[PDB]
Amino acid sequence: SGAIYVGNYRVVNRHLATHNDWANLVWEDSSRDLLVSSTTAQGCDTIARCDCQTGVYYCSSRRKHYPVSFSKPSLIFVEASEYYPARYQSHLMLAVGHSEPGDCGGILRCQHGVVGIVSTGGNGLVGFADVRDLLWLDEE
């Protein structure tokens, strides 16, 4: 589990969104596994605006923050799960690292701010849903 809190926005994995998130929906994209809902209180996170490929992510299944190198956001085939059938997930970045299903929502950060959240994994890989292209998160 986990979320990004920037401005009056809450960014979560679309497959983990709550019924309050859906009732207060701002934007969602199934192909990205992302959902953004509105919040009453202001958050403290800053979104990175960069092309960094190195950073640190939080892994709840190890209670550890791991430095990683990750690929640029791209269209990657993701096997069937209890949340989605087998499909192509877009804006996804991969790294060699540990992850388990409940690690989704763990933040990946670089020196500029939040880069994305854990969204997929398996076979010693961890996938992050990128949020750096969502410029509108920084305003209104």
Ligand SMILES: COc1ccccc1CC(=O)N(C)CCC(N)=O
């Ligand atoms: C100190 O947190 C670091 C540091 C490096 C890298 C990542 C984090 C995690 C983070 O930014 N959180 C707000 C924790 C909640 C979450 N959703 O992961």
Ligand SMILES: COc1ccccc1CC(=O)N(C)CCC(N)=O
């Ligand atoms: C961190 O996720 C891991 C890790 C290891 C093994 C399995 C998972 C769960 C996982 O990949 N999904 C539920 C897919 C979600 C999606 N974005 O389509």
Ligand SMILES: [Zn+2]
């Ligand atoms: Zn950066």
